[PDB]
Amino acid sequence: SHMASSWDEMSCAEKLLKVLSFGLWNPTYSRSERQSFQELLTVLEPVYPLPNELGRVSARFSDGSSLRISVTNSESIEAEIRTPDNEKITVLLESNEQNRLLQSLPIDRHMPYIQVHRALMDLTDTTSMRNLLGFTSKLSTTLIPHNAQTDPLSGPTPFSSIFMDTCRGLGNAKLSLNGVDIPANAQMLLRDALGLKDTHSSPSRNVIDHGISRHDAEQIARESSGSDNQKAEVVEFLCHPEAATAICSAFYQSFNVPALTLTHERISKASEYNAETPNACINISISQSSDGNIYVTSHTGVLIMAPEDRPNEMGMLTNRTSYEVPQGVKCTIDEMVRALQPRYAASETYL
Numbered sequence: 001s002h003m004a005s006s007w008d009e010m011s012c013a014e015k016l017l018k019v020l021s022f023g024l025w026n027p028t029y030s031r032s033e034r035q036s037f038q039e040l041l042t043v044l045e046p047v048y049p050l051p052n053e054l055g056r057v058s059a060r061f062s063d064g065s066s067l068r069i070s071v072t073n074s075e076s077i078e079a080e081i082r083t084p085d086n087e088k089i090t091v092l093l094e095s096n097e098q099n100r101l102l103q104s105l106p107i108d109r110h111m112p113y114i115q116v117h118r119a120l121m122d123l124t125d126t127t128s129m130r131n132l133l134g135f136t137s138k139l140s141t142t143l144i145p146h147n148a149q150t151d152p153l154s155g156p157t158p159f160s161s162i163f164m165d166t167c168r169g170l171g172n173a174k175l176s177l178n179g180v181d182i183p184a185n186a187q188m189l190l191r192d193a194l195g196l197k198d199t200h201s202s203p204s205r206n207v208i209d210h211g212i213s214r215h216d217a218e219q220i221a222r223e224s225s226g227s228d229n230q231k232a233e234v235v236e237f238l239c240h241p242e243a244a245t246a247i248c249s250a251f252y253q254s255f256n257v258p259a260l261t262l263t264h265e266r267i268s269k270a271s272e273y274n275a276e277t278p279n280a281c282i283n284i285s286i287s288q289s290s291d292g293n294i295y296v297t298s299h300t301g302v303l304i305m306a307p308e309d310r311p312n313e314m315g316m317l318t319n320r321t322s323y324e325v326p327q328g329v330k331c332t333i334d335e336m337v338r339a340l341q342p343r344y345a346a347s348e349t350y351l
Helices: 012-022 031-041 126-136 162-169 184-193 205-210 214-222 228-238 241-249 253-274 333-339
Strands: 045-047 053-060 066-072 077-082 088-093 115-118 141-143 174-177 281-288 294-305 314-325 343-350
Touching: 012 031, 012 066, 012 077, 012 088, 045 281, 045 294, 126 174, 126 281, 126 294, 126 314, 126 343, 162 241, 174 228, 184 214, 205 241, 214 228, 241 294, 241 314, 241 333, 253 294, 253 314, 253 343
Parallel strands: 115 343, 174 281
Antiparallel strands: 045 053, 053 066, 066 077, 077 088, 141 343, 281 294, 294 314, 314 343
């Protein structure tokens, strides 16, 4: 191997760390490698962060190996590597301008300018746009300040559109629960299980009080892709009221408001450049920790023109919204408004 003399003996977790140490965008990789490495990267999932952490990431690979990565507010990065035989090592990761390691993690950074990435294609094709968001959802973003005017939870009717948004979004989204992919057909089952039969529907009182029925959760998990163990985690997650809250809230259309204030002109230019446009794509990760903490990371991707410095370059604005869903918060508009405290971040990715 050109990566390491012991490459073929290394676990998925160990391989991903090596890839990131050389850099995801390393110029020596082949086309086939870039594909394989993306397949490792997509396993990364943002999860509930500890008190003084910018972010925390979990990856559970098909070979039984895993990573837990934490990033401190000073951007110190530490990883715990668990081998399939479940031995544990803790290592410090090193991010530098050569590898851009931190940029290849789903972490919200504090920066004066919006993070810019390069893709590894494009782009007016719905499938390719979804694939690009699949990638950018694993990369770093820049936190965006908001005020009373631009706060998605302000105004007279915050979250008022949430069930319509959920109804329209399920079936078209990329959705992961505890790292388990929920495919389109399973999402449609989930939509129905929430009670969202049409765009003007809202959850049943049973779902509000108890979450998805065990029967429905089992069918959804059955249609999802994972081991018998992975499906079990999904069923257990779904059968709680807070699971309904997390899933529905993740679709809120207005999470993009802070980012739009910075970018709407260039988004408009992209829409016009195409008239010479597939619309927003959605990619959501929800995880519940072993301590029971539910964390939502919801992404939307839209086409955007590069600044005038780079003429005729169209890329993707990725908006990341991150928040805990506290225990006891049921799936009603008033509950979401009362309890959810998201933060908003963005990146721009060009081909």
